[PDB]
Amino acid sequence: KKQKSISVAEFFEKNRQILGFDSAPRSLITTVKEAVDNALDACEEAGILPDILVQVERTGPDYVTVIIEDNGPGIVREQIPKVFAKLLYGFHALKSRGQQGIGISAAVLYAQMTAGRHTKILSKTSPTAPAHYYELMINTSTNEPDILVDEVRDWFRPHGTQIELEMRAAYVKGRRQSIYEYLKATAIVNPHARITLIDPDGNEEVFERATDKMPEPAEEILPHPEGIELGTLMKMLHYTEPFLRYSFCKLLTAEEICKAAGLDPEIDPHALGRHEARKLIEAFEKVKIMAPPTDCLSPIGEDLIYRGLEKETTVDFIATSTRKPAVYSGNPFVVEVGMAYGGNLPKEEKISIMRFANRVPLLYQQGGCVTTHAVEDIKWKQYGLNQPGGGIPVGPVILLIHVASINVPFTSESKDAIADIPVIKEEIDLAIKEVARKLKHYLSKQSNLKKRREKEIIITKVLPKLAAKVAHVLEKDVPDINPVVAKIMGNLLVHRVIKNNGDGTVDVAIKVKNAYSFRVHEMLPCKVKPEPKVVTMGNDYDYVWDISASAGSSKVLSYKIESASEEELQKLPQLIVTGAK
Amino acid sequence: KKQKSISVAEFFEKNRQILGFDSAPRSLITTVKEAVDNALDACEEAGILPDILVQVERTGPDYVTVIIEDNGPGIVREQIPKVFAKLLYGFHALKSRGQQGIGISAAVLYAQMTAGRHTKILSKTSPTAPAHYYELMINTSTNEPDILVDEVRDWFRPHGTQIELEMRAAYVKGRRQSIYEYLKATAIVNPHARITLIDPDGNEEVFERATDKMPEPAEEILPHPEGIELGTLMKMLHYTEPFLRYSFCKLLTAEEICKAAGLDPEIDPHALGRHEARKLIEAFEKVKIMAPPTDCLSPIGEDLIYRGLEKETTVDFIATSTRKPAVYSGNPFVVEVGMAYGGNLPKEEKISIMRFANRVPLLYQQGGCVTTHAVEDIKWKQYGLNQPGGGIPVGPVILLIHVASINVPFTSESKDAIADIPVIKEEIDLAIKEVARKLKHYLSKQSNLKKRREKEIIITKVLPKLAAKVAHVLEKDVPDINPVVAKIMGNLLVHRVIKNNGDGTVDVAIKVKNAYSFRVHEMLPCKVKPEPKVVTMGNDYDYVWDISASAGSSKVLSYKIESASEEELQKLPQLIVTGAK
Amino acid sequence: LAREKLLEIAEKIYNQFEEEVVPSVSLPSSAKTVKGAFQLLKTYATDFLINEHLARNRGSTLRELYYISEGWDYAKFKEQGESDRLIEDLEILTSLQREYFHMRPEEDGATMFGPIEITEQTKRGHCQKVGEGGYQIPFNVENIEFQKHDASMIIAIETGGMYARLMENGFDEAYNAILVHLKGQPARSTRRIIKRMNEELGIPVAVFTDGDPWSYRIYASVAYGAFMATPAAKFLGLQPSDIVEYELSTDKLTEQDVSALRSELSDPRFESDYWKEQIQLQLDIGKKAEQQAFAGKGLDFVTEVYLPNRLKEMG
Amino acid sequence: LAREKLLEIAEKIYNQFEEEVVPSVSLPSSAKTVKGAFQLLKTYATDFLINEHLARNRGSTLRELYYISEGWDYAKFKEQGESDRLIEDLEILTSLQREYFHMRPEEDGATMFGPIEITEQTKRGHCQKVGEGGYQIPFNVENIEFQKHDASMIIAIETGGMYARLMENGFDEAYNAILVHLKGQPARSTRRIIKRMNEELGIPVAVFTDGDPWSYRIYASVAYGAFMATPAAKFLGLQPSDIVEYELSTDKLTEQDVSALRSELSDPRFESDYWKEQIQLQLDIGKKAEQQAFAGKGLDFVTEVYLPNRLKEMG
């Protein structure tokens, strides 16, 4: 981002895009793409579930006013310039949003430059204190700002700080996917925050959600070799100062490195050279040591994520996963992945995937984003979502992929996607998979129940059918629809064939199609078999057989006479698996 | 346009439109909307039919390079900053293009700011002289420029000066109406110029046209009261210095004005006041005097205009008109109007009207332009162009409306249209009418010839018809198709009815339908009438009658026997208007 | 081949030629200029194939016209879009409904069944019990014969089915009737037959169509126009009121229909307060109504319940 | 009403029920699950209206089926899109062309004229000289009779005109023939008649259609499919080669046609090198060709020149 020299507004109009402002639609959103994060950045420090009201009235032909009420701790009077302007250089390699300060400053500028009306600011530190109101401006040339109003306004219910910006841009488009989506996106990932939005013309989306558990504390660190390069050594040396156990986190490895470069384990720090630099740089490469730090990042959370969605949408089956912190050439990172299936979602295909970078969102051209890629690189249909294409499985879903790292690998020079790094995708993958399966289970279970009701009808259908084949073919009647039906759900049929003579041979056959152990009774008056096992009650007796047939076994039980006809009037019970158990 | 204070690039990004640069499409065109005029502005001074090559290659993803070769007199080394930058204030109230310098500077800037590559410039004064090459830049803050390369490049065929600009914009769109149209528009109005354009990817439109007659010399002047206002008096007094016969063109009227304000016909000029100003201003209003100047403008020309089109298109009937110089509340003006009809033009409707302001074109939203308005405010169909709507008559046409005036009444604060002034439209009108009629004559004549060939067929049609009514109705035959046919073109029919008996009464009847004087012969052997007038030749005689019938007169001539049958074999000649004259 | 009571006025078309030429211009009712002169010359091509080919029998059609016309130059045809106008003009000037002139059309007015024998006359060189498809009144309605009338009512039905099944089960005997199917819009053949019985026999005639306005317009194309009517007739066909009470399945209607409903009302053509009342029902119910649908409530139902039921209360 | 040589296999549909139930599952050829179980239950509704209403006569149609079906619940119909499949299924399992089962369709196979008397049989309770529209073979082709054959060739023509005028001028006498018009695609009635003569009489049959592929496909819908053919037949109809030499006016063709030409070639269905050769002519000439167009070169022309001319050189 350089530390310039002599030119101010230009810097803008020249990076009039790499920065974020090209068109009317992204003009506004960029402003909020900042506004809202400074706030979370603020509060998240010591001031709780922060709530943020953010308006935007229609002012004139094509200009707009944007209100952004804080709720944080307000800001120190001699620190406005520093937080609402950005001409700072030099440090700091810890996990947050906007890629280094460039934030809000941009906003002020565009407003200041497009429409031109200074910039309203208002804040209160705590309960009893003045509430200051500032009208800031940046008059070019002289880079340093130029405060213009520092009075004391009465009211506000002290404890926060609102910004009011007017600037020729365009909120208006809220359909195709622009603003509402941003805060909604912001909403779902930062559960620990209340977001109310009142958009021009009158309407009000209140993302009032919760589980007030402030995020895990953002932390800082020294760097690790791998990930250091040409620019690094120039910076390290040229300015500040043993330069090994002092500014390169996680003694013996100091004196051992000096040799592999051509330097003595004692010589002085600065003014070493411009060519003896390319030699020590690899003095790290070839000697891979211990490990950077794990105790260093702040995932959003397997749980919160869950909440995030369940509260801000309308899904049916959900799954979160926060994988252990992985690492690539020096920079630590953790990726969390959540997935939600159908409901309020879209009918067929058009899968929606919203990506999330170190808590910031992203809504600009998915193409190329390591995220989208990974999404296309694996499985597909045979998992649960029947969608052909050649990349990106589609149907009523919704996927969230998060990445955290003190510094992040972005493609274009304007944080909009992640560069396809081996050790990262190698992670997101088994991470998107991490749920890609928990879904299957659901579907495998869900769709399953269907294959449990399909049946219930092929048993009130298979019925009248063999009953239509009767009052239409003069053949006895509806010939045991049961044997067949039982062969469908494939349980095990138990029936009783019977023949009459000058005797009375009756056979009870049973056959399974699944693998169990069975107990079978049968009560009658006497009898004249393939092994019995009788007990007697009252008068009529009870013949209890005992069998255990499996797979596709088919056994047959028999016996004989006594009385007649009347017999056709029973239904033999069993014990295991009518029949109890 | 103000004289600022402290801020440079901003001025731009803030007037980032009122200036002309909003979108990718108009980004480029604005650059040329300048480039090309400085040139004509130059040459038109002392250096002849200037030719201008203007390229634009595709450079990268969405940046462009634009070459603009001059042919003028080149530019003085210590005058580049002054002509390629624009931070000037103060004078000059004469007729040209760009509304006061703001020109090319803008271009340099945008290029300098969008892509950033300095700005190439190259020029030669005359045959033997160095040819200088400059790389200009404007480093903000310090407004004044900052030259960066002043070497001496070898070649060029000395006598002109080319500019090479690279800038993220968009030429590319040449269809819908953008660039080609601009130079084509520029082409047609500045006949005295050769315009070749080589657009990215390869193609070449050569507007090589002529009649090398440099325009009428641009001239300057002092102002005239009416048209002076609040801002004026502050300027006049506050800085320079009897302040009546010195700075307000076209003595007795000096001492006569002083009284009607409250000032003495002798007091000193400056430091008069801020409230005694509103009193003298009307001291002019109420005392209308002589007249500003007529000898002051430069129309393009009734002729050149003609040429302009005839050469750069494909019309059929054309008409030009350069009306005398009219005047409105102080500022002199002349309006010229040209109109061209059908041919290469469009089939039905969609009338195209290209407007022209003091030689500059215009191609931005016709709505509201005094021009378009006037176009809709009068006549329509009953003139020649059958087109309903409620404004703007449509069909295959093309209308040019020009306005000239030391200062021009524009609507929006960014010269794009003309404000509906009474005394101006009151002019354009009778001016667009000025041809609106010459067309009628054509159409009235043209469409007429149709009504001259329609006939030719209703005389080779009326024929076989009464011949179909024969070989189909056994009635004698095709009964004089002539009487009818003659009644169609409405000339005057001359026939000969004949009856036989024990005598031989034959009558020659004639009847007109238009108003002339006629002479009628008739040769035969003798005869036995309604007044004759005989002369004799050889044997058979000649009976010459003399009549003059008009309107719908119907006279009848008669006579008698001699021989018989054979008679049906003649056709009587006449003399006036078969029949000679 | 008769056609003289017309061939007379067909020549009289000419006559208004010389009496028209000899004295002045030649306007009909308009002639005089280009499209009005040519439109005339083509008079010739006309009265040429006609009067000279009326006594030699042969008869032809429209898209043949466009061909037998490719003969007379300075008068041929650039498009079969001419056939109409002219021939449609004849209908107006010689007051002779097209056909009279010996013209066949595009279609076949078949489908008719009832108790009444007959014969026609030309072409050569029972109706009570012929076949199934039987008589197919072809391209003409003035080649007649009768003498046999033991049925007191005629029947107007439309369906490549309802009529069909109104045959099997019948109706032709113990229930009088005279059957005539129509297949969509009924033009010449058919219509001029309907009329021929509603004037030369005093015998009633009712229409039975589906529900869609596309059927309710088929009565109007027999009701009047668009020699071809039977105005004193009624519609016992599926009327919006004779289905509310008769259960019957249904179906959802679309946009093209609702815009068709405000057309048979906001345009009073035969828009009585009784076709306005049952139609208003259409606005309400908001649903269609097939014609063979009775089959839903019994197959031997139409031939039993509806027809008679609705037929005793004539109106 | 016969229909027993079929009613037999129509009951045999059932039989494969118990012999199917008593022992195992019940797949036909597939049954077993939901759409394959229901699709079956509707077997019933089927073999119910049929075998029980075959000996009681009455016969009905498709959009009636959708109604007589609104009776048997747990088996009714949600859309007339069922009629096909099932009925189209019957054609495959009981090897009985639809109609056999007592089904009438959507249309009327009228238009036929020639020298051969005949009668049909059912329904009740000459062909040489009947009328003009005369016989209209209706919804069946197995109710026959013959005995009278003094014509040695049959005729396949399509036009609500060419056929018409092929009547006036005639052809029916001193030129044998048997006339049969078709009106667009010829389905059951018609076709199974064409075939019935190309097998039970050994009598040839030729097709005469316009030029448009929309006609060249009407021969293929009689040539084979899409009991219904006459494969040994030829096309003396307007073939691309019999118009190059015969002057005749023309007309420009469009996109939908050119995409239709690469379909009757890049899809070899009856694509002989002779229908490929004359078709190739279509690619070349790049123009259409009406059918009644001969009228351009004389009215008494078709009935004189083309037909015979092309008819002596059989191929």
Short mmCIF file of C-alpha atoms in Angstrom, two decimals, chain A residues 454-455 457-458 460-462 464-473 475-477 479-481 483-484 487-488, chain D residues 13-18 20-25 32-35 37-38 40-41 43-44 47-48 51-52 74:
data_model
loop_
_atom_site.label_atom_id
_atom_site.label_comp_id
_atom_site.label_asym_id
_atom_site.label_seq_id
_atom_site.Cartn_x
_atom_site.Cartn_y
_atom_site.Cartn_z
CA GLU A 454 -44.13 -45.35 -0.58
CA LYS A 455 -44.66 -48.75 0.90
CA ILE A 457 -49.53 -47.13 -0.09
CA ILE A 458 -48.31 -50.20 -1.98
CA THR A 460 -53.57 -50.19 0.28
CA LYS A 461 -52.98 -50.35 -3.44
CA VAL A 462 -51.71 -53.94 -3.86
CA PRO A 464 -57.81 -53.36 -4.07
CA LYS A 465 -55.90 -54.45 -7.12
CA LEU A 466 -56.08 -58.15 -6.40
CA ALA A 467 -59.68 -57.22 -5.53
CA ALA A 468 -60.33 -55.83 -8.97
CA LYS A 469 -58.95 -59.04 -10.36
CA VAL A 470 -61.87 -60.74 -8.63
CA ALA A 471 -65.22 -58.99 -9.20
CA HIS A 472 -63.87 -59.34 -12.72
CA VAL A 473 -62.53 -62.90 -12.97
CA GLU A 475 -61.96 -67.01 -9.41
CA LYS A 476 -62.73 -67.75 -5.75
CA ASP A 477 -61.70 -64.30 -4.51
CA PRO A 479 -56.18 -64.83 -2.86
CA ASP A 480 -53.92 -63.85 0.04
CA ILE A 481 -52.58 -60.39 -0.85
CA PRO A 483 -47.81 -63.39 0.97
CA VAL A 484 -46.89 -60.81 -1.67
CA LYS A 487 -42.45 -60.20 0.38
CA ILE A 488 -42.36 -56.47 -0.37
CA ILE D 13 -54.26 -59.87 -19.24
CA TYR D 14 -55.90 -60.64 -15.96
CA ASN D 15 -55.11 -64.35 -15.63
CA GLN D 16 -51.43 -63.30 -15.50
CA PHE D 17 -52.74 -61.92 -12.21
CA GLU D 18 -53.43 -64.80 -9.84
CA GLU D 20 -48.89 -63.87 -10.81
CA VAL D 21 -50.14 -63.24 -7.28
CA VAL D 22 -50.45 -66.68 -5.64
CA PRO D 23 -46.77 -67.40 -6.33
CA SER D 24 -44.71 -64.13 -6.24
CA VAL D 25 -44.38 -60.42 -7.13
CA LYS D 32 -43.49 -53.13 -7.75
CA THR D 33 -43.15 -49.52 -6.60
CA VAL D 34 -45.53 -46.54 -6.40
CA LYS D 35 -45.73 -45.23 -9.96
CA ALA D 37 -47.94 -50.11 -8.77
CA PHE D 38 -50.53 -47.41 -9.45
CA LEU D 40 -51.00 -51.01 -12.81
CA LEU D 41 -54.10 -50.63 -10.62
CA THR D 43 -55.52 -53.29 -15.33
CA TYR D 44 -58.67 -52.57 -13.41
CA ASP D 47 -60.16 -54.47 -18.15
CA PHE D 48 -63.29 -53.25 -16.37
CA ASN D 51 -64.47 -56.96 -21.15
CA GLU D 52 -67.64 -56.04 -19.28
CA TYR D 74 -57.98 -45.04 -5.69
#
